[PDB]
Amino acid sequence: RPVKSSFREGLTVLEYFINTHGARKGLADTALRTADSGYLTRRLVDVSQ
Amino acid sequence: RVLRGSRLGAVSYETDRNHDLAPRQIARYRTDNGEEFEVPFADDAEIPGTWLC
Amino acid sequence: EVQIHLVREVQEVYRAQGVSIHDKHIEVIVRQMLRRVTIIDSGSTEFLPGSLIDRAEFEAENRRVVAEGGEPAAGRPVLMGITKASLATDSWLSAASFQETTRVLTDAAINCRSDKLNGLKENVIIGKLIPAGTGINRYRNIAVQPT
Amino acid sequence: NSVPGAPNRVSFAKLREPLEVPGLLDVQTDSFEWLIGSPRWRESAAERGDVNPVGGLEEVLYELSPIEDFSGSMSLSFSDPRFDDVKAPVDECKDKDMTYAAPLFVTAEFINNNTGEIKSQTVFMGDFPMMTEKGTFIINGTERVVVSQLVRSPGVYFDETIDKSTDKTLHSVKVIPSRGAWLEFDVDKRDTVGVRIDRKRRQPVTVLLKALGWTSEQIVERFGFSEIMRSTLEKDNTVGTDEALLDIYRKLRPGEPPTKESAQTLLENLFFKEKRYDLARVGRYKVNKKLGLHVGEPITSSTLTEEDVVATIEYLVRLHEGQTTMTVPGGVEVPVETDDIDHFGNRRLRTVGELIQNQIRVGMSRMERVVRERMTTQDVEAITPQTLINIRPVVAAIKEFFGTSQLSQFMDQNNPLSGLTHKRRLSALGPGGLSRERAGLEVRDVHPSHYGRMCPIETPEGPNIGLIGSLSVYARVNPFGFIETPYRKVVDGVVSDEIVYLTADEEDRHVVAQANSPIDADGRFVEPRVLVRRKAGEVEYVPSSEVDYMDVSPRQMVSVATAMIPFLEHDDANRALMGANMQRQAVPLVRSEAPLVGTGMELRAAIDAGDVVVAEESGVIEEVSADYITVMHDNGTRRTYRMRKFARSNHGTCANQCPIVDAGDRVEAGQVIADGPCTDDGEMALGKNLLVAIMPWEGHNYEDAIILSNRLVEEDVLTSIHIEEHEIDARDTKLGAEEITRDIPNISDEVLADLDERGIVRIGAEVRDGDILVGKVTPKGETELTPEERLLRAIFGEKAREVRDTSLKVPHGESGKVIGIRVFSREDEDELPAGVNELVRVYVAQKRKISDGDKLAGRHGNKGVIGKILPVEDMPFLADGTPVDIILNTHGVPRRMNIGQILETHLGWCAHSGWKVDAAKGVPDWAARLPDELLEAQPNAIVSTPVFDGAQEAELQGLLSCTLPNRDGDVLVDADGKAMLFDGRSGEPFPYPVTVGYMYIMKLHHLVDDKIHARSTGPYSMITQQPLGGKAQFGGQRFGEMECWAMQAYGAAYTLQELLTIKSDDTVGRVKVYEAIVKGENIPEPGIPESFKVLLKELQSLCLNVEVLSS
Amino acid sequence: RQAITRAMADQARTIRIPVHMVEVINKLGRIQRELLQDLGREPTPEELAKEMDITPEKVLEIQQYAREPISLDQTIGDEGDSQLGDFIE
Amino acid sequence: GAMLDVNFFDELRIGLATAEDIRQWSYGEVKKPETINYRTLKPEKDGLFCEKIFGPTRDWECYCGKYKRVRFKGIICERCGVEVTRAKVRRERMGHIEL
Amino acid sequence: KRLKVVAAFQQSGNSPMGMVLDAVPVIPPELRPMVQLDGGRFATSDLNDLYRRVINRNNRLKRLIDLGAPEIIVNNEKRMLQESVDALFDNGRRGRPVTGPGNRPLKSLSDLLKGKQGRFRQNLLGKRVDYSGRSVIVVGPQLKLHQ
Amino acid sequence: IAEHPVLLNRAPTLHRLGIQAFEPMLVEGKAIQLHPLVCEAFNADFDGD
DNA sequence: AGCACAATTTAACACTTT
DNA sequence: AAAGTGTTAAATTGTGCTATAC
Ligand SMILES: [Mg+2]
Ligand SMILES: [Zn+2]
């Protein structure tokens, strides 16, 4: 499209609704990524103690 | 809330000992498939003939 | 060359996001992968083909084999992951506490496999002192007296 | 607007809206009075279609009747379910711990066919729990909320996959009903079909099709294009009806003798007899709309018919060919495309009434096979139905639903906003829905069909993002369970007002404009091209003749809690999410000042949440007092409203309720007559207005911490009231009866000073941690003392006192006054459970100030705990000597992208002091599009910026240049928004100006007094002797796995061995360490942990000879 | 039928009750359900002892025998990591 | 090698348990499917909680109650069969069922 | 694959006769307690039902054999005994799991050791400790680094 | 309490510097006062941790 | 639910009777 | 030329894992 407004001028309705896609996908990926990293740390501690 | 519970019994506080204890005698029973079992008993006790080993 | 490849391919991912990890840590991890050899021909010394044996025990049983008839066991080095190597360890108490407790406990019992308590995961379990830091003999057997 | 006693709050809105905000609790109440069959729904269904409307209970009774056995000579029929009046009123139900209910009456009728009988009896079905006025149920005294659920709708779903082996496309289907068997028609890797029925490994189409009774000419005839179908008809090898029937039976059972019953009745007993396969009244709509069957018919036949089945196969064979349309014999043609499982036209909403209906159905089906069981073992002539009916499974299913479920939750009440947004919540997890760990990344994301139906901003933050959402403002639920959304239809480029409620399916068939489009006074767009939203979610730019719908307003995509953020469109979506989630956790203060700058959604989210006493009919106030308001209506009678004072909420917060009318006022219908917990003059007030500077001050506001002034502690700006409830009960034991009395075993006479003569404390007695509330003493039967204690009794002369001492003492760390004592007794006929002689509850009030460690938060997702409370003398003050109240940090503003918290800091200064736009020669250029009566404003004026149509960035800069002087002529804030602050601690001014303003901050419910825990030695567990967990018990902090890895990586062997043996498990080491610490000796060597010797026993009980060897 | 009902008396409860007390528990439960269906409400102990020709001090004592043990190894909250045995001091 | 397992650990060996080892650990055969009394809330004989096999519920008291002090320890009460001993050996004695 | 298990039973002093059972050990009753909660309520520890079912079907087999019975009833009883002991050792493996009230599977002996709840990762590797507390944190900008 | 160190720990304990010993000093209130330089090692922020 | 992995089948093959 | 017959690959099932504290 893309979003041509800024957060000082303020976004419109459609640009904000478009922005919510990536802004929620990043949060879900952060939760799943910190779930995945502890398993890798656990296996690395166990193979090399 | 907390919900305390107990398996029914008691805990006594006699400090343990190991020298003066009333004296005991050992019986020995014999089961059907040739096994031998030693059972302690008090001296003032009628030692029974059959025992569930 | 596989050490160069593994260190470079891990450190590339860690460099692309601006994280500095020194290579000695990745080398400590990578050294624990290449510790074993697989058997081609058994010779005649108790080694099943296709089994993954430690390199030191393999060279010990190939050292002894020059006496009592020379037939050296032939094996190539293998590279295996951290789960596969962490599961195939000597200690049976340290491997059951990690993954697949049923199928580790049930083939430790068939082999009558014993433990010696030398890692620091079983000394954590049994309540002993771990053998690292102030728990080794040369540090905790210090005698202190006034001059 | 259109509320009679509203405060005059001026708005910055540049647009007008045709449709006003609906009755926000209509998602809950309209689905219950469909289930009852109230005359409101009976009218409102006919008001929009619905030629014959049937109730929620009529739909179960009409699909259970008639009960007929295999004899076929006797029939039982239920009809006309009606309700009696409620047994107890609402507040009394919350007093005596009884549930809100009403008796159910259903006319039964038993007709024997051999002689003819009509004894139609009226049967009492049960005490059915009723919904209150505010959309909540009252169960066992407490208040619960039944939450809506998102499930996929049953029907036909097509999809397309690409496998990387042979690089072709495989189109599959899934016909998923409610309560039936599955069947898929795949296309395999080799060119074939995928006709696996009830998940058993394979089939080709011609086995099922010739099993259905189709000759081998008609398969080539109807499936004639069908280059795959004749291929499978060559490679199938199975010819005939019986030869395929034996194959179907042998693949389905497996290995059973083929009969002629199991040939032609198994296929009709899996998809055609309406007791093992019944896709619901939603599903028969979906297949009729998808395949294009007989749409011009009001069909009610919930069984899978045969014709649609073969139509399904044709659809699949026209999908793996390349096509767009398909006409079936006898129906309209339809588009041919794959379906999305997460579209909002395939994701329906099981609301509150449908869950009750499912529980009543599964209860009646247990009731059903008792009736025909006693239709045989009894002798007729005559068995009234009454003999026949046993309603015990239905009431058991109802009671087992309302408690002990995950969809009937405790009401989230610590302000009206959380009470409002705990209803209107669309949760995806629960029974019959997906799980929390088995949920992929596809359902969590925002689909483009969420616009106007679910809010993309408001959702939880933990491991529940996307699984729990909330409805929009203008949304509405279909009779089938889909979600509608209003639109203004525009004809010939002229926007009319015929408001149509579209669903998510037919929204994509049209195109939809944008709400902030320049309509010019008739309906015509000013610009010839409009912004628009196309079918797949694309954002086009289309000329103004194809546009056929417009939004009814901006803020339509956004929820109720999200619409109360001023300057939403300047915040990032993560911070707006946190700001919408931190508004439902604020506590009710004792003063509750209204916000100085808000949106228009405060006044409507308070009178619809129900925590505000609203005058019913227009009258005139006769008598007001802090307990009651008697108004006198215009026609005769009076009405008394009883305010609830200092009631405990579900979460400990106060529920005070005070009037705002005097003893001579004239009121109108709907006017707010008494404020609630977090309200001020009828509108929501969650926090307070505080003077804020944005300087970083001396490292106390370092990395999100907030420092305060001491004025807020001296003047009770952020003081709340918290009420705790303590409960004890005297039961009947095996040795006697527990007695509540002042006669307590061995204890001082000083700790009995507040207890009265019958046990419990006095109202007004101040308690602390360790004081006795209810004096209760339980019989102990027998034990024999130690010789030392038996000597100590004989010296002082005290008896043994064989009864125990189990009193009710307050838990560790709590204190406060005593409000009330509620005591139920068996001797006064109160309702208590079996073997409970007495049951007493004591309420404890506590007035909490603000303290360092408490958590404050703003509206824009900014938050942080108090790190410092400075005295009022050393705090940066202005030129007046007025000190500031909070000092927020600079470095948290730019990197979090929520600078709307700066803009309400600026407008909040203007609304503090008032502007006057001097249009003495003309209105200036910035204020050309301002409304009138914003050109000037008196000080402390409340304004309102709506969500996506508010104050622009070029009008705050105008209002900042006229910011009327305080008492002397002295402008304290210049045009940039910054002021010149002195230093309260050193004296000399700060060298550069500093942004000051008025922010609206809220005190969250994450207080320090609920979080601090300490433990030296407390209760231990049962099997393994490790300590307990949590502040309710004593509990120790868990020293888990990663902490052990950290202590091993340090090299500290001895601290690890101490944390793992003599602090958790070493049972003889625990008391030895305590003795060595008290007597002052050295800590002994640890033993063996008693959780390791449990492992040896659980390994020896698995038949493993685990033996420990020495050397 | 005698063998099936005697087995359901003997080996169906974790705390073994003799068959006469199982008989009076079944009789009390049947009389309670019948009086509930006749009354449309739950009966009372002194009401139940009128039907069964016993004292009302006997009825609650009989009712406090037929309470079966709640299992120690079920998850109690929605957070599934906790069981019941982690909460009993 | 060390059944008390107090601080002398050199190895820890696992293995299959033959039927001669299972009736060597055990202190008697449980032969009734009974747990506890319903009135007297005392453990029944030859059941899953039997005192005779697993140990005393109270410290240094037998089942019938003839011996109740630490002066008698190690002996077995001739009328009830319960060895008077501490009471926390109920969490360490085993038991076996003969199939 | 077969040489692995045959060499395991050949090398050590094991014998495969321990794979079929003839006596079943019973865990001491303080590890499967029966705790009387206040209010006169009882709680059993879910291993008692499986032990009860094993000794129940064993007593019924011992009665059917002495009474004299056709082969069908005795074979059905022996299959029920096999399924009861299999439900005791590892529930839910062969066939459908034994459920209690509420359609939840009962907890067998194998479910005490597996998982992130097993005895191993829950109570052996990380424990709760005495002499500890927790609280919220605020910033302390006047302290020294060690305070 | 003088010269008696205490271990402070913040979950998750990612590296070995997530457990550190300090000496204590009695502070009125109910919040632990952390030093503003160790917050990089704990990865602690003061928004309610 | 999926991601991986190793054990256990349809079927695809030449080889040898019939 | 049919008919097995045993040996050799793709399909086919089951097992195990999935962060941390309140
Ligand atoms: Mg934080
Ligand atoms: Zn005795």
Side-chain angles (χ1 to χ4, degrees), chain F residues 53-68:
Chain F
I53 302 161
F54 312 102
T57 37
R58 353 193 50 74
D59 261 340
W60 284 296
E61 299 184 31
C62 78
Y63 182 60
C64 78
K66 193 149 62 58
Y67 305 92
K68 287 194 182 67

Side-chain angles (χ1 to χ4, degrees), chain D residues 268-274 277-302 304-305 307 309-336:
Chain D
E268 300 173 352
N269 275 16
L270 244 193
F271 306 107
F272 297 89
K273 199 172 66 59
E274 34 202 355
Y277 197 99
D278 258 340
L279 80 171
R281 205 173 159 275
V282 195
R284 248 283 108 84
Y285 186 82
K286 290 290 288 172
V287 186
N288 280 245
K289 208 163 67 58
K290 177 72 165 177
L291 307 185
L293 294 185
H294 32 238
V295 286
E297 258 184 20
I299 324 107
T300 153
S301 73
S302 52
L304 216 207
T305 168
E307 164 188 11
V309 169
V310 313
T312 303
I313 315 180
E314 178 176 11
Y315 208 119
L316 196 263
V317 97
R318 301 194 79 86
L319 188 70
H320 196 8
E321 204 192 37
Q323 235 90 207
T324 159
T325 171
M326 166 257 221
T327 154
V328 109
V332 209
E333 62 164 343
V334 271
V336 179

